[PDB]
Amino acid sequence: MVLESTMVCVDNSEYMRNGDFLPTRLQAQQDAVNIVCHSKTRSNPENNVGLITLANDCEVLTTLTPDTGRILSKLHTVQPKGKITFCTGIRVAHLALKHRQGKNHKMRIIAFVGSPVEDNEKDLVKLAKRLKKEKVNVDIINFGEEEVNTEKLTAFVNTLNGKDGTGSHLVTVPPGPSLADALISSPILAG
Amino acid sequence: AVDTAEQVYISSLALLKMLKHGRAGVPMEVMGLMLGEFVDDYTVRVIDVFAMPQSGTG
Amino acid sequence: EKLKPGDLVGVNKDSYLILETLPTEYDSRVKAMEVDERPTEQYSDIGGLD
Amino acid sequence: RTRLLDSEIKIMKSEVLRVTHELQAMKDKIKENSEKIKVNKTLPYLVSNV
């Protein structure tokens, strides 16, 4: 096993409600939460997973806790509606992981972005060299629609790592009909 | 061998919780555990009196 | 519904709270009057009292 | 057969609701049984008249 803390960053914006990505996009990101919580059950249960959004608020309803059955109950009535702010999402998740219990856990975090965010590349490079001085690899999986080939988050992937800490893997969004498990099959292959 | 003159410092939130707890369960005796800081031999302090659950039988 | 006027209720000493419901309000002397022994006098032991 | 599979996953959601029933039943029940342990095991009971 391995000691880390992955903060699932769901999108509750008003773009995640249609059915281009499979029979609900809510169900698409919900199956994503299913596979990451089962994956951290298959990982070390000493690790912890908590919920957070980037849109409409920074909503903490569960603590970053090693249980996730209550998170599976928190899957329901997510009601995705609001306006995206992922640039506060990185920092709010990072302070949530500076509110942890142990330092031997690593910090490999995922993120789900599904809307056009007003994110300057200077904003996310402040965040990115901040994470260079905060030791966090982030594996973002693009959902929804902002661009068919995301660039700002590609720039964050570029500006997070160098030569040793290349733990930034960006599944850009396939904005046409692509499956529910074919999106998350590549990070469960390689995060 | 030899033992220095001991002292029990309080924090008076201790005494206030004692009176409030014995006021809350007032027709009955209660039991509790005292929290503080082991400073040295000649003094000791209670910094915190926290609630302890009821019994009913004994 | 269980409580009619004049009931034996099992109450704690400390809390003074009703906890049980007792079934009997009797004397043990009345209990000693009860007949369990069942002697044996069949009517053939009685003669001429028809 | 899409609605049949939707109801099949909804059967698992209703099993999660049964697990929520199991949690809010067993946990709350055993906590209130523990309070009834604290209150009801006080076996000397003063009896009285209502």
UniProtKB/Swiss-Prot annotation, chain A:
GO molecular function: identical protein binding; molecular adaptor activity; polyubiquitin modification-dependent protein binding; RNA binding
Function, in words: Component of the 26S proteasome, a multiprotein complex involved in the ATP-dependent degradation of ubiquitinated proteins. This complex plays a key role in the maintenance of protein homeostasis by removing misfolded or damaged proteins, which could impair cellular functions, and by removing proteins whose functions are no longer required. Therefore, the proteasome participates in numerous cellular processes, including cell cycle progression, apoptosis, or DNA damage repair.
Any single biological process term in GO: proteasome-mediated ubiquitin-dependent protein catabolic process
Superkingdom, taxonomy of origin: Eukaryota
UniProt keyword annotations, A-Z: Isopeptide bond, Phosphoprotein, Proteasome, Repeat, Ubl conjugation
Crosslinked residue numbers (Glycyl lysine isopeptide (Lys-Gly) (interchain with G-Cter in SUMO2)): 122
Domain description: The 2 UIM motifs are involved in the binding to a multi-ubiquitin chain in a cooperative way.
Phosphoprotein among keywords: yes
Disulfide bonding pattern of the chain: none
Description of how the protein assembles with itself and partners: Component of the 19S proteasome regulatory particle complex. The 26S proteasome consists of a 20S core particle (CP) and two 19S regulatory subunits (RP). The regulatory particle is made of a lid composed of 9 subunits, a base containing 6 ATPases and few additional components including PSMD4. Interacts with NUB1. Interacts with SQSTM1. Interacts with UBQLN4. Interacts with UBE3A. Interacts with UBQLN1 (via ubiquitin-like domain). Interacts with DDI2.
Name by which UniProt lists this protein: 26S proteasome non-ATPase regulatory subunit 4
Family per similarity comment: Belongs to the proteasome subunit S5A family.
Domain (VWFA) ranges: 5-188
GO terms for cellular component: cytosol; nucleoplasm; nucleus; proteasome accessory complex; proteasome complex; proteasome regulatory particle, base subcomplex
Segment of the intact protein contained: 1 to 191 of 377
UniProtKB/Swiss-Prot annotation, chain B:
Name by which UniProt lists this protein: 26S proteasome non-ATPase regulatory subunit 14
Shown residues within the full chain: 24 to 81 of 310
Lineage of the organism: Eukaryota, Metazoa, Chordata, Craniata, Vertebrata
Highest taxon, organism lineage: Eukaryota
Protein encoded by which gene: PSMD14
Tissue: Widely expressed. Highest levels in heart and skeletal muscle.
Segment forming the signal sequence: none
Subunit details: Component of the 19S proteasome regulatory particle complex. The 26S proteasome consists of a 20S core particle (CP) and two 19S regulatory subunits (RP). The regulatory particle is made of a lid composed of 9 subunits including PSMD4, a base containing 6 ATPases and few additional components. Within the complex, PSMD4 interacts with subunit PSMD7 through their respective MPN domain. Interacts with TXNL1.
Family classification: Belongs to the peptidase M67A family. PSMD14 subfamily.
Functional description taken from the UniProt entry: Component of the 26S proteasome, a multiprotein complex involved in the ATP-dependent degradation of ubiquitinated proteins. This complex plays a key role in the maintenance of protein homeostasis by removing misfolded or damaged proteins, which could impair cellular functions, and by removing proteins whose functions are no longer required. Therefore, the proteasome participates in numerous cellular processes, including cell cycle progression, apoptosis, or DNA damage repair.
From Swiss-Prot, chain D:
PTM (free text): Sumoylated by UBE2I in response to MEKK1-mediated stimuli.
Subcellular location: Cytoplasm; Nucleus
Cysteine-cysteine disulfides: none
Region forming the signal peptide: none
Assembly and oligomerization: Component of the 19S proteasome regulatory particle complex. The 26S proteasome consists of a 20S core particle (CP) and two 19S regulatory subunits (RP). The regulatory particle is made of a lid composed of 9 subunits, a base containing 6 ATPases including PSMC3 and few additional components. Interacts with PAAF1.
Family membership: Belongs to the AAA ATPase family.
Known role: Component of the 26S proteasome, a multiprotein complex involved in the ATP-dependent degradation of ubiquitinated proteins. This complex plays a key role in the maintenance of protein homeostasis by removing misfolded or damaged proteins, which could impair cellular functions, and by removing proteins whose functions are no longer required. Therefore, the proteasome participates in numerous cellular processes, including cell cycle progression, apoptosis, or DNA damage repair.
Disease connection: Deafness, cataract, impaired intellectual development, and polyneuropathy: An autosomal recessive disease characterized by early onset of deafness, cataract, severe developmental delay, and severely impaired intellectual development. Patients later develop polyneuropathy of the lower extremities, associated with depigmentation of the hair in that area.
The protein's name in its UniProt record: 26S proteasome regulatory subunit 6A
Organism annotation: Homo sapiens (Human)
Lineage, highest ranks first: Eukaryota, Metazoa, Chordata, Craniata, Vertebrata
Gene: PSMC3
